[PDB]
Amino acid sequence: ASATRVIQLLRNWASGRDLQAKLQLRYQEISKRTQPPPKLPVGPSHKLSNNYYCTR
Amino acid sequence: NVETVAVSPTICRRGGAWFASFGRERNSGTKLFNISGHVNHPCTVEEEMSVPLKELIEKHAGGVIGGWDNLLAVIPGGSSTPLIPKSVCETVLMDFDALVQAQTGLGTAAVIVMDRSTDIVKAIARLIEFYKHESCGQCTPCREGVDWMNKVMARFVKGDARPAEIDSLWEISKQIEGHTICALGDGAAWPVQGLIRHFRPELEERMQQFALQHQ
Numbered sequence: 001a002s003a004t005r006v007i008q009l010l011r012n013w014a015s016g017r018d019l020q021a022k023l024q025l026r027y028q029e030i031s032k033r034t035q036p037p038p039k040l041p042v043g044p045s046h047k048l049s050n051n052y053y054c055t056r
Numbered sequence: 057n058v059e060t061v062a063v064s065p066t067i068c069r070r071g072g073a074w075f076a077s078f079g080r081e082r083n084s085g086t087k088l089f090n091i092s093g094h095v096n097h098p099c100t101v102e103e104e105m106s107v108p109l110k111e112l113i114e115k116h117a118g119g120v121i122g123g124w125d126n127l128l129a130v131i132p133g134g135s136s137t138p139l140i141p142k143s144v145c146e147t148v149l150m151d152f153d154a155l156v157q158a159q160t161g162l163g164t165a166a167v168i169v170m171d172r173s174t175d176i177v178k179a180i181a182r183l184i185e186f187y188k189h190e191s192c193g194q195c196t197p198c199r200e201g202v203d204w205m206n207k208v209m210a211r212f213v214k215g216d217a218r219p220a221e222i223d224s225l226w227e228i229s230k231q232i233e234g235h236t237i238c239a240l241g242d243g244a245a246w247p248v249q250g251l252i253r254h255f256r257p258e259l260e261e262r263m264q265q266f267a268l269q270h271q
């Protein structure tokens with residue numbers, strides 16, 4: 001937050017806590033909006049043998 | 057069969073007891089044997105029914121090329137019978153019951169031998185290709201499944217498959233076997249089953265060689 005130090009202390013005293021520790025506006029700490037491709041594994045019934053549907 | 061018809065007049069003339077005096081019980085008589093493949097002297101010979109396989113081969117075919125220790129596998133009863141390795145052929149008798157006990161079956165008593173210098177996978181794939189080209193296509197299991205197994209074995213020969221496909225091919229053979237109109241499907245599924253059962257390490261090693269060489 002681009003808040004001056006005097007205003008920082010004033011708001012800290014008014015609320016009675018430390019606010020810069022936990023801010024309610026998102027900043028660079030969030031994840032990127034572009035992400036690498038995933039892989040998404042398969043389920044247990046993706047076998048090539050011993051996988052008859054009558055048993056599941 | 058031609059042989060069954062041809063032996064009947066002699067059976068009538070000499071009596072059934074004389075013909076039954078040969079071989080074991082439930083396996084009586086004499087048989088015509090065709091030895092081909094990797095023997096010094098491939099030939100057709102008539103011999104007592106329950107003859108040992110090795111004794112037959114050595115006395116009539118002149119032995120296996122390169123010696124008996126050079127033997128790799130034997131197809132005892134034509135392409136429809138599953139193969140057996142040298143250990144089974146050491147003390148196996150050539151009749152219906154003993155060859156069934158070896159999980160093979162006598163079949164037509166056509167002995168095809170293979171030494172250690174030949175590709176067992178390639179020969180089995182050639183047999184499967186023969187069955188693919190000879191199926192009449194009437195019923196879906198034989199037609200589609202045999203085409204499928206032909207493709208799978210063609211991929212197996214090069215090693216282009218993964219090890220998990222061996223059990224898939226076994227299950228495909230199980231699906232074909234016992235579900236067709238005639239026994240051609242069984243006679244195509246059995247060689248694959250025998251090849252898998254007796255040479256799974258060979259297929260796996262071929263696949264891993266392909267995997268390393270292609271990365």
Ligand code: SF4
Nearest residue numbers: 192193194195198236
């Ligand atoms: S199993 Fe026999 S009847 Fe069925 S498609 Fe094959 S050859 Fe024809």
